[PDB]
Amino acid sequence: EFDAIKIALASPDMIRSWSFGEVKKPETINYRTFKPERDGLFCARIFGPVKDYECLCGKYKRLKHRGVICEKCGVEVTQTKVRRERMGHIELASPTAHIWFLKSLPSRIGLLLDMPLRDIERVLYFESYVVIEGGMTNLERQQILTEEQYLDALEEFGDEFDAKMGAEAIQALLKSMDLEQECEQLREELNETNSETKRKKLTKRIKLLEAFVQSGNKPEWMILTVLPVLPPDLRPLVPLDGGRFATSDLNDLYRRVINRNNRLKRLLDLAAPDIIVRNEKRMLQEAVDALLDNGRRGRAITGSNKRPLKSLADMIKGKQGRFRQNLLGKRVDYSGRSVITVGPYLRLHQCGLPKKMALELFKPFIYGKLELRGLATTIKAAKKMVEREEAVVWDILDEVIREHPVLLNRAPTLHRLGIQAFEPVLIEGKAIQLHPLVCAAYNADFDGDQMAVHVPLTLEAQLEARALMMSTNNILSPANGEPIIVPSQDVVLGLYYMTRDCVNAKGEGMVLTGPKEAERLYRSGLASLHARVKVRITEYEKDANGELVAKTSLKDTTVGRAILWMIVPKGLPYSIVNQALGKKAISKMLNTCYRILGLKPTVIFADQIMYTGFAYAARSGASVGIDDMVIPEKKHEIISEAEAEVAEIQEQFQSGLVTAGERYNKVIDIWAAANDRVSKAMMDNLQTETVINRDGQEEKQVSFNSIYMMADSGARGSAAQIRQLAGMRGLMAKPDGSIIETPITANFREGLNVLQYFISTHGARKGLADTALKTANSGYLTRRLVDVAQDLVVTEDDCGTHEGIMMTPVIEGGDVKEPLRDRVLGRVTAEDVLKPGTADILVPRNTLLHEQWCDLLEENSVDAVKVRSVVSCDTDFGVCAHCYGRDLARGHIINKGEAIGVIAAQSIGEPGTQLTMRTFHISSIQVKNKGSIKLSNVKSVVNSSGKLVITSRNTELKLIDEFGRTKESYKVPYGAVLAKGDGEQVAGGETVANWDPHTMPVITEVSGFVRFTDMIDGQTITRQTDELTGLSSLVVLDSAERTAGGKDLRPALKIVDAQGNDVLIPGTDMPAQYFLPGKAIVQLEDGVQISSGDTLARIPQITGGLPRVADLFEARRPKEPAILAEISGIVSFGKETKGKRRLVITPVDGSDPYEEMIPKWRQLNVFEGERVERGDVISDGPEAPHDILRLRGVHAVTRYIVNEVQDVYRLQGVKINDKHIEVIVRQMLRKATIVNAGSSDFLEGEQVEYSRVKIANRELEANGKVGATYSRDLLGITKASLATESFISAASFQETTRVLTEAAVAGKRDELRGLKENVIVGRLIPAGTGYAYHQDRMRRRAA
Amino acid sequence: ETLRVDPTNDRLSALVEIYRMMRPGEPPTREAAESLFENLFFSEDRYDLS
Amino acid sequence: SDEADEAYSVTEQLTMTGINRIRQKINAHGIPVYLCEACGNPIPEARRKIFPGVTLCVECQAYQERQRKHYA
Amino acid sequence: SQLKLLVTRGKEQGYLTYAEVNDHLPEDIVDSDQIEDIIQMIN
Amino acid sequence: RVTVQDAVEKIGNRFDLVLVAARRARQMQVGGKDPLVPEENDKTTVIALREIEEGLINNQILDVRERQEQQE
Ligand SMILES: [Mg+2]
Ligand SMILES: [Zn+2]
Ligand SMILES: [Zn+2]
Ligand SMILES: [Zn+2]
């Protein structure tokens, strides 16, 4: 209907154009009749009638007079709702500066006039006079003239001298300023002023100037002269009870402006002295500031309430403002709430709606269906009938309710499974009954949560409910595709109890024809629920052309596993229920049923699992008692043993052998080891009971103790709480982080005495405070990630890129923490993946790697798969459907129009709230496996004694078996003592490297004589005389206490011939001298026989939490950034200690401008003659992420972040598919800086949206001209969200005044195109089912 | 080492820094600074400790 | 999750993190150094019987603790 | 220059207390209106 | 109807399914039609998915039928 929203500056003629009159009196109403006045603040001639189609006078009160204007009071007969939209104006008697355009911090008026803010705020409050086109009378235009200076400079000059003060001065400055004339002269001086600050200020001003000409606004419109008043229905005067009233504070601010303008009108009618009119104009200007923004000038004036008033800026800006609190967070008809109960008779797709709530919610539906069937004639008759709730309106309502979903929603809606649609089943009572499987998807328990239920009215929203939001359509977690409808606690106790064997149960060793015979035997009481029998099992396998090949065998199972086999569908084997079936086993069983059979049999299977689990958990009779906590009998001995140990260390601290700090450390360690001992004793006492038998002998078995049966099944809780029940409680913490050294030797099956109970409350109170403080900040990160990723929607089917990250699992040292089948599943192959024979294509290209393909490439032992990633997608304002991958909440490939930015924001935020809200930090190589060693950067030398020491820098270790995949991955030190040779497959149990951090040698390449030239002790070395053996040591110094005669000069480690001829470098015509950085332990002599690789100069020696994923996305610069090798080439040092060392990497074929200001406190990894390429390590520690993007590719900060963020998630144990961090990163670094502006239409120092760069460079290379190159920039997720395109969207999460002033002066437009834009505006989103509507409207524009 | 930084050395210039910490800008008179300070911690009508 | 189970996870993270941060400061296995690393004093043999790997003596470590009591 | 060191110290540590601004105000200004205008300027 | 799985695979897109079934349910509810699949006392938006399930309503079949309704 409007298609775009355009912002500008209001013309004074336009302000009078909106107006329907002028407000002249500050009266609001009549005070007696409560009537609107003749020309007051709540006027009726201006804004309209108080009653619908009725004059204020009373004459033309008839509905026949609609549209006429009465002659007695001047009102127009219209609706009274027209005074919701009618403005008036206030013609101010003096001009007055808009405080939005002055006291903004860029201060558009100040930046425009080429005068600082102190200038204009001095002139505006009547201090200084200002020259406006001052002729040629010895002056400067735009100059401050203070009052006495203006007076004595008016002397000797009969010219009228053109010096005003106040907003008349600034208005005549803004009018007489030609913008384009100044643009041409500014570009003229820009032709001749290539400096840094000068050119920076000139282009910085010329940006706002070129925007101001191309916008169409006038600079004199920033100085206000006529003031718009709001409609009276937006600052109402509602009559409350008892004669009392209630107004808005804008009434007081408009009353202040009307008062001061009327009084200034009189004071300029009266030819008053100038000081009181100066004070009146300054007061009226202050009143306009308090009206438009009460507090940007200072201070925010309070009325008869001691809070500040809410102004117009405060009515758009703020948490309670219309932009935040009323454009999205808004109450909703056809909605209600009540508490949740279980009611597990339900299916997965129904909720239990109460009957009074369904009578209330579905009222117009009931009326239409009740009068369509004609049991009432009038809608008044329908109203009286269903108010009476007769015996027929329940039949009509259960007809209405049949297939009509209700959106059940619980309040902390962290992700999209907080809203699901359920078919309503009418129950009595007043509580919503809710299927027990989805309680883990809402995080909704039954200690009194209430679920809000909405109704979808339209057929489009009914079908959106049924097709997306039905609880059976969403059974995979959208974070990682595992099922979220995992059976949680009673179902897993039932499924664990029926399927866990007993050694001698009733009915042992029988042979049954199948599960029917097993249920018949159990239900008649002839066999126990778990007795090892031989059941005949028909298990179907679709290991053919979707066949379901059947096969019947004779399995060795228990009775209850056979009974549970009946609810299994066909495609699953029997070995999935032939086990204990704890919690993870039911998760894997439902996952197997989904991966094999699809969506519907998983829903029927999960329902039958829930029914069977509740039923056999009921028939379990699984109680809990006081004899289900068996206290270990050795607990007294371990407690007495630890008390004897801490008595001994108390003695040896009384003897002064150890201090109190080590004594506290020793007793903490002793009591913690004793607590582990007691827990081990009780956990071994609990998990093995003695049962007897088929033959009457003693036979251990896993105990049926109900507390062990709850802990081991994964029903509720784990062995730590069983430690606090039977074993000892342990050492208790403190809010200081410290540990109370007197532990709690008691437990909860015994009691706690008063001291231990007072000790426990520090840790428990700190835990509950941190819980209840975290829930007040639940989705702050989800909000901060939907701001950055609002407008990312899948728009393309296949953009067709060839790039992408190449995915390899996390082998950190030994094991692999997360394999390849976790990552490469669901992603799209960016290339053709060949076999390890490098001969045949395994998966072609553009393929959805499902579990069959990933099973195939894991059978083929493939290791280096290049997936299609989101950060390398070739489409604009969106991703393609293949560069994302698959949906993960459905298992299919993604659809066109899924809002994956919001989905990934939620799938980082909702698993992210399971992380800790406070942060927490925590010889020879252990060679275990055998195989072949692979080395990259491998340049090793032989030694004489057979050992090896590697002289290349980054030769890190890779062990391969005969499978292709990496086995042992480690960093080899620079010259550690290897027993590893080269390439030869070794056996495990033999050290490959004997490292020592005291050992970093400068081991030679060739053998020879290390004679020393340019070597003077005293100004280059220290006098090191090792009395230890009596050796000649020359340990070189830093730039600390040597002379400056040998500071820049370096001592030579020159290895020469037996005669003394300078041996060459193999490959390089330079000499053999290895000049040394600081602190090298040298044992050498001039002329000693040493071999190649001799130890000449040895050098001496995981955070978790939600704040880490806060700081990983904000992309902080760490205080110890590991500096890099900025450019490829061999290295040299630089200037010694002007505060910092320099270091000139010199490329052998390129220029070397980089002598980097390296502090001497961060010691070199490298030697100063050691060739390192670009993107290579210099310092040691946390690598800064911006340096990864500048130096290495965009797949190296993509691989850095989504491995560093997942190192926080996998540390706690929370799994998440790494699509979700990649669409946030893809929206993070969508800024490029220009460096070669070329024939492209951008400046040099220009940061712009990258996908506008990549399309101009697409088109300006599509001509016969050449396009720009760009250096990618990466920003924080509070700063990437700042540079949005929209201004309606940007004013909802950023500060509105700085946004709306920046938007107005640019004359900006908003073609809407965004999720938050159209949600505010009231249209369909451009994401979901409203993508095609934004096709249907982007069809009609290319008409 | 806090005497090694302390620019004042006797009580007349000591009340100067105290009066210019309380009320800046004004020239500290020899009675105006001292009558502010002695009434600040040692007089019942300003410094009440219960 | 009953609002006193997330309390339980926070409290167990507190106790386990603090106790591991203490037990990492026990320096269990080491070398018999026989001489302190800031004084060169002979560390008595019962002290190495208590702690294997004390590079500091008793009272120089006591001075280290007293210096580290505040920070810096 | 002292208020410039206040700007640099605030952006160098990420926060400002009342003690740090009150130690980095000049010597010439007295009353509390202008100094909390300066607090808004830095705020 | 419980799940729209056959319906979303018979169209190929989940949101255009919602739009097509919404158009068909509008024709069946207020447009004036008859159900193509027999309605087993279903609401109007379940008949639309059971017409999409049997291949009887897609976008082009609905559009050529709109052509035929204009043809008279
Ligand atoms: Mg609860
Ligand atoms: Zn009238
Ligand atoms: Zn793509
Ligand atoms: Zn010592």
SS (H, E, C) A1051-1096: CCCEEECCCCCECCECCECCCCCCCCCCCCEECCCCCCEECCCCCC
Domain boundaries, chain E: 1-72
Determine the Cα–Cα distance for residues A1123 and A1157; give it in Å rounded to an integer: 10
Read off φ and ψ for residue A700, nearest 5 degrees.
Answer: -70, 150
Residue type (1 letter), A443: N
Q: Do C7 and A720 touch (CB under 8 A)?
A: no
> Which chain A residues touch C13 with a CB distance below 8 Å?
916, 920
Residue pair A885/A828 in contact (Cβ under 8 Å)? The answer is: yes
Interface of A with D in 292-321 (CB under 8 A): 298-299
Contacts of A39 by beta carbon, 8 Å cutoff, 6+ apart: A21, A22, A23, A24, A25, A45, A46
- C35 interface with A at CB cutoff 8 Å: no
CA of A869 to the centre of ligand 3 (A): 8
Residue pair D1/D11 in contact (Cβ under 8 Å)? The answer is: no
Determine the Cα–Cα distance for residues C11 and A916; give it in Å rounded to an integer: 11
Q: Indicate the DSSP class of residue A324.
A: I
3-state secondary structure A265-277: HHHHHCCCCHHHH
Q: Please confirm whether the linkage preceding A299 is cis (ω < 30° from 0).
A: yes
Residue pair A186/A205 in contact (Cβ under 8 Å)? The answer is: yes
Transcribe A551-564 into DSSP letters. EEEEEEE-HHHHHH
Strand order in the sheet with A1247-1249: A1247-1249, A1231-1236, A1269-1273
> Considering every ligand atom, which ligand is closest to the CA of C6?
1
Resolution limit, Å: 3.5
Determine the Cα–Cα distance for residues C65 and A152; give it in Å rounded to an integer: 75
Instruction: Report whether A449 belongs to an annotated binding site.
Output: yes
CATH topology of domain A634-775: Topoisomerase I; Chain A, domain 4 (1.10.132)
A and E interact (at least 3 Cβ pairs within 8 A): yes
Tokens of E22: 């919404």
Determine the Cα–Cα distance for residues A445 and A442; give it in Å rounded to an integer: 9
> Which chain A residues touch C59 with a CB distance below 8 Å?
659
Helix axes A754-774 and C6-23, enclosed angle (nearest 10): 110
Nearest to A181 by CA among A137, A215, A212: A212
> Which chain A residues touch C16 with a CB distance below 8 Å?
none
Rg (CA), chain D: 10
Q: Do A896 and E26 touch (CB under 8 A)?
A: no
Determine the Cα–Cα distance for residues A623 and A497; give it in Å rounded to an integer: 12
> Which chain E residues touch A468 with a CB distance below 8 Å?
14, 18
Instruction: Report whether A43 belongs to an annotated binding site.
Output: no
> Considering every ligand atom, which ligand is closest to the CA of A45?
2
Contacts of E7 by beta carbon, 8 Å cutoff, 6+ apart: A467, E17, E21, E49, E52, E53
Q: Which residues are registered as beta bridge partners of A4? A: A1311
Determine the Cα–Cα distance for residues C1 and A410; give it in Å rounded to an integer: 14
Structurally, what CATH architecture does the domain formed by E1-72 represent? Alpha-Beta Complex (3.90)
Chain D residue set in contact with B, beta carbons under 8 Å: 27-30
CA of A932 to the centre of ligand 3 (A): 38
Residue type (1 letter), A1324: L
Residue type (1 letter), A929: N
Residue pair A1166/A1182 in contact (Cβ under 8 Å)? The answer is: no
- C67 interface with A at CB cutoff 8 Å: no
CA of A59 to the centre of ligand 2 (A): 6
Tokens of A1165: 């990894």
- A1119 interface with D at CB cutoff 8 Å: no
Contacts of C39 by beta carbon, 8 Å cutoff, 6+ apart: C57, C60
Q: Do D30 and B24 touch (CB under 8 A)?
A: yes
Chain B residue set in contact with D, beta carbons under 8 Å: 20, 23-25
Residue pair A885/A807 in contact (Cβ under 8 Å)? The answer is: no
- E13 interface with A at CB cutoff 8 Å: yes
Residue pair A133/A162 in contact (Cβ under 8 Å)? The answer is: yes
Q: How many CA atoms lie within 13 A of A244 on its CB side?
A: 4
Structurally, what CATH architecture does the domain formed by A1289-1341 represent? Orthogonal Bundle (1.10)
Q: Nearest C-alpha of chain A: how many angstroms from E71? A: 24
Determine the Cα–Cα distance for residues A1227 and A1250; give it in Å rounded to an integer: 10
> Which chain C residues touch A736 with a CB distance below 8 Å?
none
**Max intra-chain CA distance, chain B:** 37
Q: How many CA atoms lie within 13 A of A48 on its CB side?
A: 20
Nearest to C40 by CA among C23, C62, C24, C55: C55
Q: How many CA atoms lie within 13 A of A456 on its CB side?
A: 27
> Which chain A residues touch D36 with a CB distance below 8 Å?
298
Q: How far is CA A957 from CA A601, A602, A936, in A?
A: 48, 46, 8
Q: Nearest C-alpha of chain D: how many angstroms from A104? A: 11
Residue pair A351/E4 in contact (Cβ under 8 Å)? The answer is: no
> Considering every ligand atom, which ligand is closest to the CA of A76?
2
- A362 interface with E at CB cutoff 8 Å: no
Q: How many CB pairs under 8 A join A and D?
A: 5
Q: Which residues are registered as beta bridge partners of A1272? A: A1232
Residue pair A1259/A1206 in contact (Cβ under 8 Å)? The answer is: no
- Contacts of the segment A283-286: beta carbons below 8 A, 24+ positions apart: A284/A92, A284/A93, A284/A94, A284/A96, A284/A257, A284/A260, A285/A94, A285/A96, A285/A97, A285/A124, A285/A125, A285/A166, A285/A167
| Ion ligand 3 nearby residues (CB, 5 A) | A 799, 873, 880, 883
Residue pair A463/E45 in contact (Cβ under 8 Å)? The answer is: yes
Select the residue of E5, E25, E42 nearest A463 (Cβ to Cβ).
E25
Transcribe A687-701 into DSSP letters. SEEEE--SSS--EEE
Instruction: Report whether A883 belongs to an annotated binding site.
Output: yes
Nearest to A20 by CA among A281, A228, A188: A228
Q: Do C3 and A669 touch (CB under 8 A)?
A: no
For tokens 């109370």, the residue is A740
> Which chain D residues touch A299 with a CB distance below 8 Å?
33
Tokens of A189: 């001086």
